[PDB]
Amino acid sequence: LFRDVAEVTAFRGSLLSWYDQEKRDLPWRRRAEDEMDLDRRAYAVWVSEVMLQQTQVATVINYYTGWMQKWPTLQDLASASLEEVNQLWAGLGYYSRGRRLQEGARKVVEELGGHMPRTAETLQQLLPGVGRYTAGAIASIAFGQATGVVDGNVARVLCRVRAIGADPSSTLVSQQLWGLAQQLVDPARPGDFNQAAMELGATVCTPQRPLCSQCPVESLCRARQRVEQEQLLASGSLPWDQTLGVVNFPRKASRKPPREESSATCVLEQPGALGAQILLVQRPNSGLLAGLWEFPSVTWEPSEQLQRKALLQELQRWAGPLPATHLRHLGEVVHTFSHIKLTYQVYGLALEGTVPPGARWLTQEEFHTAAVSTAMKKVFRVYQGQQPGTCMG
DNA sequence: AAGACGTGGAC
DNA sequence: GTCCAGTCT
Ligand code: SF4
Protein backbone atom coordinates (compact mmCIF):
# COMPACT_ATOMS: atom_id res chain seq x y z
CA LEU A 1 0.00 0.00 0.00
CA PHE A 2 1.03 3.66 -0.44
CA ARG A 3 3.40 4.64 2.38
CA ASP A 4 3.18 8.44 1.95
CA VAL A 5 -0.05 10.39 2.57
CA ALA A 6 1.27 13.15 0.31
CA GLU A 7 1.18 10.79 -2.70
CA VAL A 8 -2.35 9.52 -1.99
CA THR A 9 -3.52 13.14 -1.96
CA ALA A 10 -1.72 13.99 -5.23
CA PHE A 11 -3.02 10.86 -6.94
CA ARG A 12 -6.64 11.86 -6.22
CA GLY A 13 -6.19 15.48 -7.17
CA SER A 14 -4.43 14.71 -10.45
CA LEU A 15 -6.88 11.99 -11.48
CA LEU A 16 -10.03 13.95 -10.66
CA SER A 17 -8.66 17.07 -12.28
CA TRP A 18 -7.93 15.08 -15.46
CA TYR A 19 -11.30 13.34 -15.33
CA ASP A 20 -13.22 16.59 -14.94
CA GLN A 21 -11.53 17.77 -18.12
CA GLU A 22 -11.30 14.56 -20.26
CA LYS A 23 -14.20 12.29 -19.31
CA ARG A 24 -16.29 10.78 -22.06
CA ASP A 25 -19.96 11.77 -22.43
CA LEU A 26 -21.64 8.51 -21.47
CA PRO A 27 -25.42 8.08 -21.25
CA TRP A 28 -25.49 6.44 -17.80
CA ARG A 29 -23.08 9.02 -16.38
CA ARG A 30 -25.39 11.87 -17.43
CA ARG A 31 -28.47 10.04 -16.24
CA ALA A 32 -27.04 9.31 -12.76
CA GLU A 33 -25.70 12.85 -12.29
CA ASP A 34 -29.01 14.36 -13.39
CA GLU A 35 -31.40 12.13 -11.45
CA MET A 36 -32.38 13.73 -8.13
CA ASP A 37 -34.42 10.83 -6.66
CA LEU A 38 -32.07 8.39 -4.98
CA ASP A 39 -33.89 5.15 -5.79
CA ARG A 40 -34.13 6.19 -9.45
CA ARG A 41 -30.46 7.20 -9.50
CA ALA A 42 -29.31 3.97 -7.88
CA TYR A 43 -31.41 1.91 -10.30
CA ALA A 44 -29.92 3.80 -13.27
CA VAL A 45 -26.41 3.06 -12.04
CA TRP A 46 -27.31 -0.54 -11.24
CA VAL A 47 -28.53 -1.20 -14.79
CA SER A 48 -25.46 0.34 -16.41
CA GLU A 49 -22.97 -1.50 -14.18
CA VAL A 50 -24.63 -4.87 -14.83
CA MET A 51 -24.61 -4.21 -18.59
CA LEU A 52 -20.92 -3.23 -18.35
CA GLN A 53 -19.80 -6.52 -16.72
CA GLN A 54 -17.44 -8.14 -19.23
CA THR A 55 -18.93 -5.87 -21.89
CA GLN A 56 -17.41 -2.89 -23.59
CA VAL A 57 -18.75 0.65 -23.25
CA ALA A 58 -19.23 0.96 -27.02
CA THR A 59 -21.49 -2.09 -26.91
CA VAL A 60 -23.53 -0.95 -23.90
CA ILE A 61 -24.28 2.41 -25.57
CA ASN A 62 -26.49 0.45 -27.95
CA TYR A 63 -28.59 -1.04 -25.11
CA TYR A 64 -28.69 1.24 -22.06
CA THR A 65 -30.89 4.12 -23.22
CA GLY A 66 -33.42 1.76 -24.77
CA TRP A 67 -33.64 -0.16 -21.50
CA MET A 68 -34.02 2.96 -19.34
CA GLN A 69 -36.64 4.49 -21.67
CA LYS A 70 -38.72 1.32 -21.50
CA TRP A 71 -38.23 0.67 -17.78
CA PRO A 72 -37.27 3.99 -16.12
CA THR A 73 -37.74 2.69 -12.54
CA LEU A 74 -37.35 -0.43 -10.42
CA GLN A 75 -41.10 -0.82 -10.36
CA ASP A 76 -41.39 -0.81 -14.14
CA LEU A 77 -38.68 -3.45 -14.40
CA ALA A 78 -40.27 -5.50 -11.63
CA SER A 79 -43.62 -5.73 -13.48
CA ALA A 80 -42.04 -6.76 -16.79
CA SER A 81 -41.71 -10.33 -17.97
CA LEU A 82 -38.44 -12.23 -18.32
CA GLU A 83 -39.27 -12.76 -22.02
CA GLU A 84 -39.31 -8.97 -22.47
CA VAL A 85 -36.00 -8.70 -20.59
CA ASN A 86 -34.43 -11.33 -22.83
CA GLN A 87 -35.58 -9.50 -25.96
CA LEU A 88 -33.80 -6.38 -24.79
CA TRP A 89 -30.72 -8.28 -23.71
CA ALA A 90 -30.40 -10.29 -26.96
CA GLY A 91 -26.88 -9.76 -28.16
CA LEU A 92 -25.35 -8.52 -24.91
CA GLY A 93 -24.23 -11.97 -23.74
CA TYR A 94 -24.23 -13.57 -20.27
CA TYR A 95 -28.02 -13.57 -20.15
CA SER A 96 -28.23 -14.41 -16.44
CA ARG A 97 -27.37 -10.71 -15.92
CA GLY A 98 -30.69 -9.61 -17.37
CA ARG A 99 -32.64 -12.23 -15.42
CA ARG A 100 -31.02 -11.26 -12.09
CA LEU A 101 -31.55 -7.53 -12.76
CA GLN A 102 -35.29 -8.13 -12.98
CA GLU A 103 -35.36 -10.57 -10.05
CA GLY A 104 -33.43 -7.99 -8.04
CA ALA A 105 -35.95 -5.28 -8.93
CA ARG A 106 -38.79 -7.58 -7.87
CA LYS A 107 -36.97 -8.25 -4.60
CA VAL A 108 -36.49 -4.52 -3.90
CA VAL A 109 -40.17 -3.89 -4.59
CA GLU A 110 -41.55 -6.90 -2.70
CA GLU A 111 -39.09 -7.36 0.18
CA LEU A 112 -37.67 -3.83 0.69
CA GLY A 113 -40.65 -1.60 -0.12
CA GLY A 114 -39.04 -0.17 -3.26
CA HIS A 115 -36.03 1.19 -1.35
CA MET A 116 -32.57 0.49 -2.71
CA PRO A 117 -30.08 -0.40 0.03
CA ARG A 118 -27.57 2.43 0.45
CA THR A 119 -24.27 0.70 1.22
CA ALA A 120 -22.03 -1.61 -0.75
CA GLU A 121 -22.25 -4.36 1.89
CA THR A 122 -26.04 -4.47 1.86
CA LEU A 123 -26.32 -4.10 -1.93
CA GLN A 124 -24.00 -7.07 -2.35
CA GLN A 125 -25.79 -9.08 0.34
CA LEU A 126 -29.30 -8.42 -1.01
CA LEU A 127 -29.12 -8.15 -4.84
CA PRO A 128 -28.39 -11.16 -7.04
CA GLY A 129 -26.03 -10.23 -9.90
CA VAL A 130 -24.47 -7.53 -7.74
CA GLY A 131 -21.00 -8.62 -6.70
CA ARG A 132 -18.34 -6.61 -4.90
CA TYR A 133 -17.62 -4.43 -7.96
CA THR A 134 -21.22 -3.52 -8.87
CA ALA A 135 -22.18 -2.91 -5.21
CA GLY A 136 -19.29 -0.51 -4.71
CA ALA A 137 -20.05 1.23 -8.02
CA ILE A 138 -23.73 1.77 -7.10
CA ALA A 139 -22.89 2.85 -3.53
CA SER A 140 -20.10 5.29 -4.50
CA ILE A 141 -21.77 6.78 -7.59
CA ALA A 142 -25.41 6.89 -6.50
CA PHE A 143 -25.08 7.41 -2.71
CA GLY A 144 -21.61 8.92 -2.33
CA GLN A 145 -20.22 6.22 -0.07
CA ALA A 146 -16.37 6.18 0.12
CA THR A 147 -15.94 2.65 -1.16
CA GLY A 148 -13.30 1.85 -3.77
CA VAL A 149 -13.75 -0.67 -6.57
CA VAL A 150 -11.45 -2.83 -8.72
CA ASP A 151 -12.44 -3.87 -12.25
CA GLY A 152 -10.10 -4.94 -15.05
CA ASN A 153 -9.25 -1.29 -15.82
CA VAL A 154 -8.41 -0.36 -12.23
CA ALA A 155 -6.39 -3.54 -11.67
CA ARG A 156 -4.27 -2.66 -14.70
CA VAL A 157 -3.69 0.93 -13.51
CA LEU A 158 -2.82 -0.24 -9.98
CA CYS A 159 -0.55 -3.07 -11.06
CA ARG A 160 1.43 -0.59 -13.16
CA VAL A 161 1.44 2.28 -10.63
CA ARG A 162 2.67 -0.08 -7.88
CA ALA A 163 4.64 -2.48 -10.16
CA ILE A 164 2.79 -5.63 -9.08
CA GLY A 165 4.04 -8.50 -11.23
CA ALA A 166 2.38 -11.40 -9.45
CA ASP A 167 -0.79 -13.05 -10.78
CA PRO A 168 -3.73 -10.64 -10.20
CA SER A 169 -6.27 -13.49 -9.94
CA SER A 170 -4.44 -14.84 -6.86
CA THR A 171 -6.10 -14.15 -3.51
CA LEU A 172 -3.06 -12.33 -2.14
CA VAL A 173 -2.90 -9.95 -5.10
CA SER A 174 -6.63 -9.37 -5.41
CA GLN A 175 -6.58 -8.45 -1.74
CA GLN A 176 -3.76 -5.91 -2.28
CA LEU A 177 -5.65 -4.31 -5.20
CA TRP A 178 -8.87 -3.85 -3.19
CA GLY A 179 -6.90 -2.38 -0.28
CA LEU A 180 -5.13 0.02 -2.60
CA ALA A 181 -8.44 1.08 -4.07
CA GLN A 182 -9.88 1.62 -0.61
CA GLN A 183 -6.86 3.67 0.45
CA LEU A 184 -7.01 5.84 -2.69
CA VAL A 185 -10.76 6.41 -3.11
CA ASP A 186 -11.43 10.14 -2.57
CA PRO A 187 -13.70 10.59 0.49
CA ALA A 188 -15.42 13.76 -0.87
CA ARG A 189 -15.83 12.55 -4.51
CA PRO A 190 -15.74 8.75 -4.21
CA GLY A 191 -18.03 8.15 -7.19
CA ASP A 192 -16.10 10.38 -9.58
CA PHE A 193 -12.82 8.99 -8.33
CA ASN A 194 -13.92 5.42 -9.12
CA GLN A 195 -15.24 6.47 -12.54
CA ALA A 196 -11.98 8.34 -13.11
CA ALA A 197 -9.80 5.33 -12.33
CA MET A 198 -11.85 3.17 -14.69
CA GLU A 199 -11.74 5.90 -17.36
CA LEU A 200 -7.96 6.15 -17.08
CA GLY A 201 -7.62 2.42 -17.54
CA ALA A 202 -9.94 2.56 -20.54
CA THR A 203 -8.52 5.56 -22.47
CA VAL A 204 -4.96 6.23 -21.23
CA CYS A 205 -3.50 3.28 -19.29
CA THR A 206 -4.68 0.81 -21.90
CA PRO A 207 -3.76 -2.87 -22.40
CA GLN A 208 -1.37 -1.90 -25.19
CA ARG A 209 0.18 1.39 -26.28
CA PRO A 210 -0.64 3.25 -23.04
CA LEU A 211 -0.38 7.02 -23.30
CA CYS A 212 1.97 7.53 -20.33
CA SER A 213 3.14 10.92 -21.63
CA GLN A 214 -0.42 12.28 -21.27
CA CYS A 215 -1.24 10.38 -18.14
CA PRO A 216 -2.25 12.44 -15.05
CA VAL A 217 -0.46 10.10 -12.60
CA GLU A 218 2.78 9.50 -14.60
CA SER A 219 5.10 10.92 -11.92
CA LEU A 220 3.58 8.59 -9.31
CA CYS A 221 3.67 5.46 -11.50
CA ARG A 222 6.39 2.94 -10.65
CA ALA A 223 6.29 1.13 -13.98
CA ARG A 224 6.67 4.42 -15.86
CA GLN A 225 9.59 5.51 -13.68
CA ARG A 226 11.34 2.26 -14.45
CA VAL A 227 10.65 2.62 -18.21
CA GLU A 228 11.98 6.19 -18.23
CA GLN A 229 15.28 4.98 -16.76
CA GLU A 230 15.51 2.12 -19.25
CA GLN A 231 14.68 4.29 -22.30
CA LEU A 232 18.05 5.98 -21.69
CA LEU A 233 20.23 2.88 -21.34
CA ALA A 234 22.85 3.12 -24.08
CA SER A 235 23.88 -0.55 -23.69
CA GLY A 236 21.87 -3.73 -23.33
CA SER A 237 21.77 -5.43 -19.91
CA LEU A 238 22.79 -9.12 -20.07
CA PRO A 239 10.69 -11.85 -15.51
CA TRP A 240 10.66 -8.12 -16.53
CA ASP A 241 10.97 -7.83 -20.34
CA GLN A 242 12.45 -4.42 -21.18
CA THR A 243 10.78 -4.35 -24.66
CA LEU A 244 7.31 -4.51 -23.06
CA GLY A 245 7.83 -1.54 -20.74
CA VAL A 246 4.83 -0.87 -18.50
CA VAL A 247 2.86 -3.56 -20.35
CA ASN A 248 4.86 -6.06 -18.28
CA PHE A 249 2.10 -5.38 -15.75
CA PRO A 250 -0.33 -6.93 -15.00
CA ARG A 251 0.89 -10.52 -15.58
CA LYS A 252 -1.08 -11.76 -18.60
CA ALA A 253 -3.74 -14.19 -17.34
CA SER A 254 -3.95 -17.14 -19.75
CA ARG A 255 -7.42 -18.48 -20.56
CA LYS A 256 -8.10 -22.21 -20.55
CA PRO A 257 -8.80 -23.26 -24.18
CA PRO A 258 -12.47 -23.89 -25.00
CA ARG A 259 -14.20 -27.29 -25.15
CA GLU A 260 -15.16 -28.20 -28.74
CA GLU A 261 -18.79 -29.16 -29.31
CA SER A 262 -20.98 -29.71 -32.33
CA SER A 263 -24.65 -29.71 -33.03
CA ALA A 264 -26.99 -29.70 -35.98
CA THR A 265 -29.81 -27.26 -36.39
CA CYS A 266 -32.53 -26.73 -38.97
CA VAL A 267 -34.40 -23.66 -40.19
CA LEU A 268 -37.93 -24.72 -41.18
CA GLU A 269 -39.77 -22.25 -43.40
CA GLN A 270 -43.38 -22.13 -44.51
CA PRO A 271 -45.55 -19.56 -46.28
CA GLY A 272 -47.78 -17.34 -44.18
CA ALA A 273 -50.48 -14.70 -44.42
CA LEU A 274 -48.28 -11.84 -43.17
CA GLY A 275 -45.16 -13.34 -44.80
CA ALA A 276 -43.01 -16.43 -44.60
CA GLN A 277 -42.41 -17.93 -41.14
CA ILE A 278 -39.66 -19.98 -39.54
CA LEU A 279 -39.95 -22.29 -36.52
CA LEU A 280 -38.38 -21.38 -33.18
CA VAL A 281 -38.41 -23.50 -30.00
CA GLN A 282 -37.52 -22.39 -26.47
CA ARG A 283 -34.42 -23.63 -24.65
CA PRO A 284 -34.69 -24.91 -21.03
CA ASN A 285 -34.64 -22.26 -18.30
CA SER A 286 -31.19 -23.49 -17.08
CA GLY A 287 -27.69 -23.86 -18.47
CA LEU A 288 -26.37 -22.46 -21.73
CA LEU A 289 -28.45 -19.62 -23.23
CA ALA A 290 -31.10 -20.38 -20.65
CA GLY A 291 -34.62 -19.70 -21.84
CA LEU A 292 -33.64 -18.19 -25.20
CA TRP A 293 -35.22 -19.22 -28.50
CA GLU A 294 -33.39 -21.25 -31.16
CA PHE A 295 -33.91 -23.27 -34.29
CA PRO A 296 -34.60 -26.93 -33.49
CA SER A 297 -31.32 -28.66 -32.78
CA VAL A 298 -29.95 -32.11 -32.11
CA THR A 299 -26.60 -33.33 -31.04
CA TRP A 300 -24.01 -34.44 -33.53
CA GLU A 301 -24.28 -37.85 -35.23
CA PRO A 302 -21.45 -39.96 -36.68
CA SER A 303 -22.91 -40.13 -40.21
CA GLU A 304 -24.85 -37.82 -42.50
CA GLN A 305 -27.77 -40.26 -42.66
CA LEU A 306 -28.08 -40.54 -38.88
CA GLN A 307 -27.84 -36.75 -38.55
CA ARG A 308 -30.70 -36.19 -40.97
CA LYS A 309 -32.80 -38.83 -39.22
CA ALA A 310 -32.32 -37.23 -35.78
CA LEU A 311 -33.04 -33.73 -37.13
CA LEU A 312 -36.25 -34.80 -38.87
CA GLN A 313 -37.36 -36.62 -35.71
CA GLU A 314 -36.79 -33.43 -33.70
CA LEU A 315 -38.48 -31.27 -36.34
CA GLN A 316 -41.49 -33.54 -36.49
CA ARG A 317 -42.13 -33.15 -32.73
CA TRP A 318 -43.09 -29.53 -33.51
CA ALA A 319 -44.38 -29.41 -37.10
CA GLY A 320 -45.80 -32.90 -37.83
CA PRO A 321 -44.66 -35.16 -40.69
CA LEU A 322 -42.24 -33.46 -43.08
CA PRO A 323 -40.74 -34.25 -46.53
CA ALA A 324 -37.31 -35.73 -45.81
CA THR A 325 -36.11 -35.35 -49.40
CA HIS A 326 -36.44 -31.55 -49.18
CA LEU A 327 -33.93 -31.35 -46.26
CA ARG A 328 -30.73 -29.48 -47.26
CA HIS A 329 -27.32 -29.22 -45.63
CA LEU A 330 -26.55 -25.51 -46.07
CA GLY A 331 -23.28 -24.81 -44.25
CA GLU A 332 -21.88 -24.44 -40.75
CA VAL A 333 -21.39 -21.76 -38.12
CA VAL A 334 -18.49 -21.76 -35.67
CA HIS A 335 -19.56 -19.79 -32.62
CA THR A 336 -17.27 -18.90 -29.74
CA PHE A 337 -18.47 -18.78 -26.15
CA SER A 338 -15.98 -18.13 -23.33
CA HIS A 339 -15.82 -21.88 -22.47
CA ILE A 340 -17.18 -23.67 -25.61
CA LYS A 341 -16.34 -23.43 -29.31
CA LEU A 342 -19.60 -24.69 -30.79
CA THR A 343 -19.82 -25.73 -34.45
CA TYR A 344 -23.40 -25.78 -35.77
CA GLN A 345 -24.18 -27.73 -38.93
CA VAL A 346 -26.95 -25.68 -40.57
CA TYR A 347 -29.84 -27.32 -42.41
CA GLY A 348 -32.91 -25.86 -44.05
CA LEU A 349 -36.23 -27.23 -45.18
CA ALA A 350 -38.75 -25.04 -46.97
CA LEU A 351 -42.32 -26.31 -47.17
CA GLU A 352 -44.17 -25.60 -50.44
CA GLY A 353 -47.59 -25.12 -48.76
CA THR A 354 -51.52 -26.20 -34.76
CA VAL A 355 -48.39 -25.32 -32.70
CA PRO A 356 -47.35 -27.14 -29.50
CA PRO A 357 -46.36 -24.99 -26.54
CA GLY A 358 -42.68 -24.24 -26.40
CA ALA A 359 -42.77 -23.50 -30.17
CA ARG A 360 -43.34 -20.29 -32.16
CA TRP A 361 -43.62 -19.48 -35.84
CA LEU A 362 -42.07 -16.08 -36.58
CA THR A 363 -41.76 -13.76 -39.57
CA GLN A 364 -38.38 -12.33 -40.50
CA GLU A 365 -39.25 -9.05 -38.72
CA GLU A 366 -40.41 -10.87 -35.53
CA PHE A 367 -37.24 -12.97 -35.48
CA HIS A 368 -34.99 -9.89 -35.73
CA THR A 369 -36.48 -8.61 -32.42
CA ALA A 370 -36.86 -11.97 -30.71
CA ALA A 371 -34.92 -13.27 -27.70
CA VAL A 372 -32.40 -15.29 -29.71
CA SER A 373 -28.69 -15.72 -29.15
CA THR A 374 -26.24 -14.27 -31.68
CA ALA A 375 -25.30 -17.88 -32.59
CA MET A 376 -28.79 -18.43 -33.94
CA LYS A 377 -28.73 -15.08 -35.77
CA LYS A 378 -25.61 -16.36 -37.56
CA VAL A 379 -27.43 -19.60 -38.36
CA PHE A 380 -30.32 -17.68 -39.86
CA ARG A 381 -27.88 -15.70 -42.08
CA VAL A 382 -26.50 -18.94 -43.48
CA TYR A 383 -30.01 -20.06 -44.28
CA GLN A 384 -30.80 -16.67 -45.83
CA GLY A 385 -27.80 -16.77 -48.13
CA GLN A 386 -27.83 -20.47 -49.04
CA GLN A 387 -31.36 -21.97 -49.05
CA PRO A 388 -32.50 -22.12 -52.72
CA GLY A 389 -35.73 -20.23 -53.28
CA THR A 390 -36.15 -18.79 -49.78
CA CYS A 391 -38.25 -15.67 -49.33
CA MET A 392 -36.69 -14.84 -45.91
CA GLY A 393 -33.71 -13.07 -47.58
C1' DA B 1 -11.58 -21.77 -6.13
C1' DA B 2 -11.67 -23.28 -11.00
C1' DG B 3 -15.13 -23.55 -14.29
C1' DA B 4 -19.85 -21.94 -16.27
C1' DC B 5 -21.53 -18.29 -18.45
C1' DG B 6 -21.83 -14.50 -24.56
C1' DT B 7 -20.22 -11.42 -27.39
C1' DG B 8 -17.45 -8.13 -29.82
C1' DG B 9 -14.02 -4.21 -30.23
C1' DA B 10 -8.94 -3.44 -30.75
C1' DC B 11 -4.77 -4.53 -32.01
C1' DG C 1 -5.80 -15.19 -34.56
C1' DT C 2 -5.78 -13.20 -29.34
C1' DC C 3 -6.79 -10.29 -25.60
C1' DC C 4 -9.62 -8.05 -22.52
C1' DA C 5 -14.16 -5.51 -21.49
C1' DG C 6 -17.68 -9.76 -13.38
C1' DT C 7 -20.84 -13.12 -10.78
C1' DC C 8 -21.78 -17.38 -8.66
C1' DT C 9 -20.87 -21.83 -7.17
S1 SF4 D 1 2.18 6.36 -16.55
FE1 SF4 D 1 1.59 4.79 -18.15
S2 SF4 D 1 1.60 2.79 -17.01
FE2 SF4 D 1 1.63 4.48 -15.42
S3 SF4 D 1 -0.58 4.77 -14.85
FE3 SF4 D 1 -0.08 6.27 -16.47
S4 SF4 D 1 -0.58 5.22 -18.51
FE4 SF4 D 1 -0.50 3.58 -16.88
Numbering used by the authors: 86 to 323, 348 to 462, 468 to 507
Source paper text:
MUTYH is a clinically important DNA glycosylase that thwarts mutations by initiating base-excision repair at 8-oxoguanine (OG):A lesions. Improperly placed adenines within pro-mutagenic OG:A base pairs are removed by the adenine glycosylase MUTYH, as the first step in Base Excision Repair (BER). The [4Fe-4S] cluster is coordinated by four cysteine ligands within the N-terminal catalytic domain, while the Zn(II) ion is coordinated by three cysteine ligands in the interdomain connector region (IDC) and one histidine within the catalytic domain. A loop made by two Cys residues that coordinate the [4Fe-4S] cluster, referred to as the iron-sulfur cluster loop, mediates electrostatic interactions with the DNA backbone that are critical for recognition of the lesion containing substrate.
To provide insight into the impact of cancer associated variants (CAVs) and roles of the [4Fe-4S] cofactor in MUTYH function, we obtained the first crystal structure of human MUTYH in complex with DNA and defined structure-function relationships for 12 [4Fe-4S] associated CAVs. Crystals diffracted to high resolution (1.9 Å) with a synchrotron source and refinement yielded final R/Rfree values of 0.180/0.209. In the MUTYH-TSAC, MUTYH embraces the entire DNA helix with contacts mediated by the two functional domains in a manner similar to other MutY homologs. However, within the IDC region we were unable to observe electron density for residues 324-347 in chain A and 319-346 in chain D (there are two copies of the MUTYH-TSAC in the asymmetric unit) nor did we observe electron density for the Zn and its coordination sphere. X-ray absorption spectra of the MUTYH-TSAC crystals lacked the ~9650-eV peak characteristic for Zn. These observations suggest Zn was lost during the crystallization process. Intriguingly, inspection of the MUTYH-TSAC crystal structure revealed an intricate hydrogen bonding network that spans the 20 Å distance between the [4Fe-4S] cluster and the adenine excision pocket. The connection involves four residues with strong evolutionary signals as shown by residue coupling correlation analysis, starting with the [4Fe-4S] cluster ligand Cys290 that H-bonds with Arg241, which in turn interacts with Asn238, and lastly this Asn residue H-bonds with the key catalytic residue Asp236. In addition, the amide hydrogen of the side chain of the Asn238 also interacts with the 5’ phosphate of the 1N nucleotide. These connections make use of the multivalent Arg241 and Asn238 residues: Arg241 adopts a C-like shape that enables the positioning of internal NH1ε moiety of the guanidine group to donate a H-bond to the main chain carbonyl amide of Cys290.
